[model samples]
Target: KSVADFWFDPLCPWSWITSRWILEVAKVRDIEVNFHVMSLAILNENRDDLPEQYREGMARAWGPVRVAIAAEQAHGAKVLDPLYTAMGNRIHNQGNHELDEVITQSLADAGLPAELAKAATSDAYDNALRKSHHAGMDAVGEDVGTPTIHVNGVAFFGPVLSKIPRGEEAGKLWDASVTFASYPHFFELKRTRTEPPQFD
Candidate 1:
């Protein structure tokens, strides 16, 4: 089976939807999805270029990504799947904005220790987080954001879906995306999103 490396930040609703689409693709395609951590906090850090409201969001974005990195450090790469799923469920689906409670509950959901939640406020894991962040960000260049997907050694920023595609529709999208990325001359194909992310 081929492997699809997916990098994400749990706080992003679009990334959450894209991740679900890829998971669906995996069910019908000959691919395995491996999750990694990437941070919107780090992506926009110290940049005065963002709007004030978005900058405030970037500040809060640090907590979840930090805890994600900490869990991966203490456990292993496998922990990220459940951790991201748990955090994404609350942040996007449940509309829970209290990150402290989100972190605590997500840790329980992922079977991680509550002590890992302290990593949110500490910079102790930031180094590893940055390394992991760059591993994905560097491949697609800094111009675009999560979720970045790599398949057969080709990387692309997104096929950013507002709605998750299910069953064979998911597999067909995956095949098309990989075909696009495989072409050395292909860069982007985009359109304005007509709707916000639909979690269901």
Candidate 2:
């Protein structure tokens, strides 16, 4: 099986959906998906062009990714899958906006220590977090956003699905993605999003 490195910020609904699809792909294909942190807050930091509401939302985005890096640091890279799932279930599936409660509950759910949540407001993990963020972002270039995936020495921004594909369909999409990545000249294929991500 080939390893696929997936980078995401837990706050992004699109990234959440894409992540689920990649997991589904893992089930039906020879792909092992590994999770990593990429921050939306850090991506948009110091930018004055964003709208007020989104800029305000970015302030709340920092907590989850920080705690994610802390969890990985304290435990190991393996913790990210379950930790992200726990956080995503609350954030996306339940629409839970209470971040502190989400982080606390997610830590418990992931079987991580409660003290790890303290990393959220602290900048102690910022250096490691930024290192990880840049690793993924730099691979795909600064123009793209999260849900970045690297596999077979090729990195791309997203396949950005609205719903998760399962079974053979997931495998087919994975096949197609790999095929697209094989050609060095291939860049993008996108259309305007017409629907919000379906959490189910």
Candidate 3:
């Protein structure tokens, strides 16, 4: 299995767009991606740990995420549609301050209930989401931020600019990591032929 640890705040257009692609890639690839939706906006603060670009950044990230959760509920494990991709593209391709309507529209287009938008924004799931995200961050290693992809504990360091589509790159990275882990030179089996690796 392979894992991708992202220092992610969904509001970032780069994060959102790339993440949309990541999900798309996850569907086709023979890998497991651990999506960490932590707030990089919170990390930029001096004392408070808030990102300097906190307000606008968080809003951008969360907008598409709310819509995404709704889309997941509606579509389940199906082909992710424009609802997912467009939300990310909205920010990446266009200007900001208009995501509210887009998020709503996308969820509706996905055939999910409208209440999801409200629930996603509500304070109810906030802490739980944060806790899960923080735990993911810790698992991958802390002191990182959005668009940062890590595969099998190896950090991509920065956002990957791929020759193929965004998500395709994610899959490629995942495959590379798996290859690295199995490389005989990089990783040697300590156990001898008499003692094969055991299970159960």
- Candidate 2 regions exceeding 4 Å error are 43-54, 127-143
TM-score per prediction, in order, is: 0.88, 0.88, 0.53
Model 3 residue 152 CA deviation in Å: 4.5
Clashes of each: 0, 0, 9
lDDT, model 2, position 8: 80
Better of 1 and 3 by lDDT: 1
Please list the residue runs of candidate 3 whose C-alpha ends up more than 4 Å from where it truly belongs after superposition. 1-8, 20-29, 32-36, 42-83, 131-143, 148-157, 162-200
Report the C-alpha lDDT of model 1 over 31-102, residue by residue, as the tens digit: 888787776556446655322234556446668878887887778778888888888888888888898899
* Tens-digit per-residue lDDT, 51-117, candidate 2: 2324556546668878988887778768889999999999989988898899999999999999998
Question: Lowest lDDT 10-mer window, candidate 1?
Answer: 134-143
Model 3 RMSD in angstroms = 11.6
